[PDB]
């Protein structure tokens, strides 16, 4: 399975942004990146191009989007625990459904 999936809450443990909590919107496995909303906001200088029906307007000024972040800098956020902390996860397989599930190793919380 994968450490980070599309949807789970995640934070950053290194870089300029420390303790930045967000939701992963999309995961690129090949480049080992991850787009997390609200973090790594870059502002491309949007030019103007008019060669299509939609390009006839293409209103783009100082649009702030999302920059991808290396998957190593991401860490899963705990929610079930009363005192939330950042830890590592296991890949135990519960015989109830025989499906692999991530479980933290500093607690007993699933996913």
Partner RNA sequence: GGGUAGGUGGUAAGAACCUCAGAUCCGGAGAUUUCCGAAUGGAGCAAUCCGGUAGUUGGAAACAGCUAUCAUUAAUUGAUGAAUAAAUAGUCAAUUAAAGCAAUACGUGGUGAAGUGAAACAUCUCAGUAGCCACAGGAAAAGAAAACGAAUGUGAUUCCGUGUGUAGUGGCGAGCGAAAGCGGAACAGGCCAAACUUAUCAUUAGAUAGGGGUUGUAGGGCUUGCAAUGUGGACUUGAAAACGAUAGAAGAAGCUGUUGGAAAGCAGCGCGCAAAAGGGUGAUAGCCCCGUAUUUGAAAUUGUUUUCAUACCUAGCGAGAUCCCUGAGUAGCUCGGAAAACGUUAUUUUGAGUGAAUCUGCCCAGACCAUUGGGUAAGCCUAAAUACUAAUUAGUGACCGAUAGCGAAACAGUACCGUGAGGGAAAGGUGAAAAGAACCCAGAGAUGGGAGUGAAAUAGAUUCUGAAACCAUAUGCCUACAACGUGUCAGAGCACAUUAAUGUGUGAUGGCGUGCGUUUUGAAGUAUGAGCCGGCGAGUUAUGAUAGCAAGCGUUAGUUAACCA
Partner RNA sequence: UUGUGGUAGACGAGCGUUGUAUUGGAGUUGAAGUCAAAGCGUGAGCAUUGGUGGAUCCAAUACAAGUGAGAAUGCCGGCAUGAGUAACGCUUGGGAGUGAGAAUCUCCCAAACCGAUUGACUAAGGUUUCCUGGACCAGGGUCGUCCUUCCAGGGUUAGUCUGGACCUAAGCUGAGGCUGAAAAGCGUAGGCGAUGGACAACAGGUUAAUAUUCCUGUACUUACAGUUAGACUGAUGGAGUG
Partner RNA sequence: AAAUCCAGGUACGGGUGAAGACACCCGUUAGGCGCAACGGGACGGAAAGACCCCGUGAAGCUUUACUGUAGCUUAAUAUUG
Handedness of CA 24, 5, 15, 88 (dihedral sign): positive
Q: Does 70 bind RNA (CB under 7 A)?
A: yes
Dihedral angle of Cα 22, 93, 97, 89, to the nearest 10 degrees: -10
Closest to 84 measured CA to CA, from 19, 18, 5: 19
Among 10, 36, 75, 78, contact with RNA (rule: CB under 7 A): 75
Among 72, 79, 84, 107, contact with RNA (rule: CB under 7 A): 72
Among 57, 79, 91, 107, contact with RNA (rule: CB under 7 A): 91
Among 58, 100, 107, 111, contact with RNA (rule: CB under 7 A): 100
DSSP string, 39-57: SS----------SSTTTTT
Q: Does 96 bind RNA (CB under 7 A)?
A: no
Contact footprint for RNA (CB under 7 A): 1-6, 13-18, 26-30, 32, 42-48, 61, 67, 70-73, 75, 86, 88, 90-91, 100, 105
């Amino acid at each position: 399975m994968q450490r980070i999936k599309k949807g789970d809450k995640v934070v950053v443990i290194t870089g300029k942004n420390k303790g930045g909590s967000g939701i992963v919107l999309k995961i690129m496995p090949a480049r080992q990146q991850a787009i997390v909303e609200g973090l790594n906001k870059v502002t491309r200088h949007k030019k103007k191009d008019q060669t299509t029906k939609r390009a006839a307007k293409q209103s783009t000024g100082k649009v702030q989007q999302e920059a991808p972040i290396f998957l190593s800098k991401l860490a899963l956020f705990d929610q079930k625990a009363k005192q939330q902390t950042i830890g590592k996860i296991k890949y135990v397989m519960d015989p109830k459904t025989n499906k692999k599930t991530r479980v933290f190793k500093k607690s007993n919380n699933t996913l």
